[PDB]
């Protein structure tokens, strides 16, 4: 009588055969799954048929009495009443280190180099390879936290500046990732799905735990990167009709129409805010309505309306000030083929909306991080012309400089201010140019024959144009763009795909330190100390 002693008696069990016993027990398990689970199941047999009595053993008293009181009194098939009776010292190096030059990400020859390539002196340090844990890339989270594997071998955490092994997360058959800015979460996405008992092709595990914070299934994928916000207090996670929220980490869905929307195309998290914007496909009379909202107040304060629009893609200012919507709309009313931007002003009072038109459509867009300028590039691949706009805080915006017979369509935005790098490097050639500020000029051209992509450093130190192996031929080089015409890189390492900044912490800077740099006058020592190091 010792041990479990948890044998029960569930009356009004139906008599069935042995071949239909699996389907009948699954319906009996689904009925018992309201308050419990099945770990031991037995049924008596009378001449091959069931006797009419079965048992569900739990091996504790507590929920076996509660499931007995929740299953009795109900007439089962139509008529029969069932009756149941029974580390921090090592890792975060890159803020307070000696040099403060922006590191990069290195991959060449698909596993023959997995490294960091330095902002170098052509010295031996850093001499790097990190062995055989990753096939596809050395891949980072936005706090610099990771050197990772995108592979079936898993999703990997490795910390330090010197590639120490921290943590290995469970993924078989993985296709993708999603990375947090605030170093709170990570995701993996799998192209081979798991079984329906815990149905998942989005398996997402926290950065702290190495175990799943939320997990759910995925049947379709529109584009690359269910992402994390600047602070990560609220997130957006749907499956394939919806927009609704998953909370950090509890997957809390709210009952709001404001945080949970029906049937929209595109959404974001704001660069400065806790704020979500979207656009809705139009009804017959009712407009296409982009909404500016707040999450925890559960209300729509700000609704833009524009009649006779077809589609919209969103671009926020990278400090969260302005939101420009580029349309592929031409009016059905007028013949004229013209596009418009609705520019909101979120930080200014009562959200003004201004319009600025063009005679042509746009192929790109750029919003300036921390600047009172704006760069807008419109036109086809032979006719891609960029216009540098200067938008004040109070007033309207205008156009300063338009260039005929230009192809500069790739814009790498620096964190330093007052400088833009403009490349024509998409898939016919590379043509680079620097767009400086106060005054706007076209002053320089750096030659690149191999490069495909242009992105800049989180300090303001380098905007790099580099090459890809499986998208173009072997013409290979690495030529990054410095502002002064000086050479920023010389490297050819075979089958290299990218080189981009491994990021740094939140700086939490002040205006007083920039005011001292707002004063040769005191900055005289740094060239002379370099001259003693360059002596022979």
């Amino acid at each position: 009588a010792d041990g479990i002693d948890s044998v029960i008696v569930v009356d009004n069990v139906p008599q069935v055969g042995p071949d239909r016993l699996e389907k009948l027990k699954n319906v009996i398990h689904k009925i018992f799954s309201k308050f419990g689970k099945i770990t031991n199941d037995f049924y008596p047999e009378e001449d091959g048929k069931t006797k009419g009595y079965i048992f569900l053993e739990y091996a504790s008293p507590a929920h076996a009495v509660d499931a007995v009181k929740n299953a009795d009194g109900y007439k089962l098939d139509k008529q029969h009443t069932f009756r149941v009776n029974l580390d921090l010292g090592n890792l975060r190096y890159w803020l307070e280190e000696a040099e403060c030059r922006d590191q990069y990400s290195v991959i060449f020859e698909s596993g023959d180099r997995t490294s960091i390539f330095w902002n170098d002196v052509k010295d031996p340090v850093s001499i790097e390879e990190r062995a055989r844990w990753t096939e596809t890339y050395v891949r980072w989270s936005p706090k610099g936290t990771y050197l990772a594997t995108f592979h079936q071998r898993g999703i990997a955490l490795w910390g330090g500046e010197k590639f120490k092994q921290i943590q290995r997360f469970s993924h078989q058959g993985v296709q993708l990732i999603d990375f947090s800015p605030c170093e709170r979460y990570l995701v993996t996405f799998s192209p081979l799905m798991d079984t329906q008992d815990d149905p998942q092709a989005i398996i997402i595990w926290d950065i702290l735990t190495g175990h799943k914070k939320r997990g759910f299934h995925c049947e379709s994928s529109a584009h690359w990167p269910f992402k994390w916000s600047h602070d990560g207090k609220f997130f957006a996670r749907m499956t394939l009709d919806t927009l609704s929220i998953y909370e950090t980490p509890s997957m809390g869905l709210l009952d709001k129409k404001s945080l949970k929307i029906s049937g929209i195309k595109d959404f974001s998290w704001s660069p400065g805010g806790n704020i979500i914007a979207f656009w809705v496909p139009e009804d017959k009379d009712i407009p296409a309505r982009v909404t500016l909202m707040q999450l925890p107040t559960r209300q729509e304060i700000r609704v833009r309306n524009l009649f006779n629009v077809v589609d919209c893609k969103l671009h926020w200012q990278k400090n969260g000030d302005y939101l420009c919507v580029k349309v592929d709309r031409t009016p059905k009313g007028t013949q004229g083929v013209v596009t418009n931007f609705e520019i909101f002003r979120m930080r200014e009072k009562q959200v003004p909306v201004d319009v600025v038109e063009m005679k042509e459509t746009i192929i790109a867009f750029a919003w300036e991080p921390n600047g009172s300028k704006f760069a807008v590039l419109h036109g086809e691949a032979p006719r891609i012309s960029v216009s540098f706009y200067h938008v004040k805080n109070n007033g309207k915006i205008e156009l300063i400089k338009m260039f005929d017979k230009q192809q500069a369509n790739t814009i790498f935005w620096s964190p330093q201010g007052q400088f833009v790098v403009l490349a024509g490097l998409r898939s016919m050639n590379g043509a680079l140019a620097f767009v400086d500020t106060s005054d706007c000029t076209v002053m320089n051209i750096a030659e690149h024959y191999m490069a495909s992509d242009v992105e800049w450093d989180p300090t303001g130190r380098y905007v790099v144009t580099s090459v890809s192996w499986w998208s173009h031929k072997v013409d290979n080089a690495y030529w990054l763009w410095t502002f002064q015409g000086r050479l920023l890189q010389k490297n050819n390492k075979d089958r290299f795909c990218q080189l981009l900044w491994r990021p740094r912490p939140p700086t939490l800077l002040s205006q007083e330190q920039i005011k001292q740099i707002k004063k040769k006058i005191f900055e005289q020592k740094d060239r002379l100390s370099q001259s003693k190091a360059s002596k022979e």
């Binding site: 419990g36 507590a62 307070e96 000696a98 740099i517 005191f522 900055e523």
Partner: peptide, 27 residues
């Protein structure tokens, strides 16, 4: 030059597993 001047759980998991084991034994 202005830039260069600027330059320079185990107990909780065990308690969760014990709570999961107690819930599964009840169920």
């Amino acid at each position: 030059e202005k830039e260069k001047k600027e330059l320079q759980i185990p107990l909780i998991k065990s308690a969760y597993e014990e709570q999961r084991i107690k819930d599964m034994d009840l169920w």
